[PDB]
Symmetry: C2
Subunit: 252 residues, 2 copies
């Protein structure tokens, strides 16, 4: 029924010092962006800076962890449980990021279990999907994205607190450039998959955000697409340019 | 003489309320001198700032893991540089749970140890054999191979502690004896003497990472080649203080 609220997530990845975090947070705190009714803004620092960011960031921007454990805490040295994030009043978590799928070998099932467990503790989830250059060149884009999405869908009963991020991994460090039209094509096919395989209502209300290369310059052209509901920003999330990407929400 | 070393691995446990209680209990503790025992406490990443800001300054804070190299495009990982930036002096690397559950290879662990040392972190480097490996007669083959992957990459032995985890005796129904701990620690120290140097063998702490409680701490701690403990679950409880007090056995 109601329009999907534009969503901008900033994934800091494995970057930051206390000094850099203070500079980034000060820059965001002084930013003048569209209303909380027009855009939902989430910033995702490394685990060790979650307390500093949550304590100092403007209350109308929300904090995400970059990962959490698949289940209840216990004998999992080095892992952070969903209930720890809830305990520290961290409302969001990024799960299934292409870097964790590729470098740390997180399976679609492992990601699905994490999403279900995070939602069960009351966290909101940015659930990431995306195909490699090999998969795209093989003609497997929608087979891979549908399979990643299905592993999540099979474990999720309530999509209200889920945002899906499409990462064109094929266009990240390969020399290949994703067009806005190519982004819109995958977002459209993914939403049609949700409509047929979950429900018309879930398809209509679930934000699908673009996790490819976005800057101030291309944000309105990418953002001004029928099935693109915002961005999961990588490196630019550390820079003032992030504010220009948030401002792309006015295109809707 | 090697200074007795007691690490407390909280693992994936804690809330702000539980952390405050644990830290208050440690802050009120009366334990042996800084000459007799070195104490390290390892909370989850998200509680490192709270623990570092509130813990007695003569106990040291460790992260439970860090990334293998320089930060960048590694969503969810915490770099050695970040820990140094937050004045976290120690890191646990190659814990049996990360080797077994998260499939960290001996080479990956070795690279993490080298990178952590290079940023100025002190490292508790963990090694240990499974029940299958122990029953196959492969205990010292496995421990030597895991240690070699680390030793090949170490740039400062002063800042390394080795933790032997008898993984075969964690949730299997098997009980690791003081004699079995002593045997592995002695053979590991002899490996260091032959493969690194007599001086590194003589001065490097080898701590026992098996099931340690108030009751068995003095008998384990009294062994010639056991230089202390990496404590699991008991590290969350007042009993951790009784384990630190085992250092007086040396």
């Amino acid at each position: 029924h109601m329009a999907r609220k534009f969503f901008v997530g900033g994934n800091w990845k494995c970057n930051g010092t206390a000094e850099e975090v203070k500079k980034i947070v000060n820059t965001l705190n002084e930013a003048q962006v569209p209303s909380q009714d027009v855009v939902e803004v989430v910033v995702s620092p490394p685990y060790v800076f979650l307390p500093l960011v949550k304590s100092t960031l403007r209350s109308d921007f929300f904090v995400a962890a970059q990962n959490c454990w698949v289940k209840k805490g216990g004998a999992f040295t080095g892992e952070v449980s969903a209930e720890m994030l809830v305990n520290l009043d961290i409302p969001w978590v990024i799960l299934g990021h292409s870097e964790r799928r590729a470098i740390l070998n997180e399976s679609s099932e492992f990601v699905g279990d994490k999403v279900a467990y995070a939602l069960a503790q009351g966290l909101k989830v940015i659930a990431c999907v995306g195909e490699t250059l090999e998969e795209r060149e093989a003609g497997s884009t929608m087979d891979v994205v549908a399979a990643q999405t299905k592993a999540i869908a099979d474990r999720v009963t309530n999509w209200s607190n889920v945002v899906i991020a499409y990462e064109p991994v094929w266009a990240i460090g390969t020399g290949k450039v994703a067009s806005p039209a190519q982004a819109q094509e995958v977002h459209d096919e993914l939403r049609k998959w949700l409509a047929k395989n979950v429900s018309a209502d879930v398809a209509a209300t679930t934000r699908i955000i673009y996790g490819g290369s976005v800057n101030g310059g291309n944000s309105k052209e990418l953002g001004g697409q029928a099935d693109v509901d915002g961005f999961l920003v990588g490196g630019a999330s550390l820079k003032p340019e992030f504010i220009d990407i948030i401002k792309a929400a006015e295109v809707k």
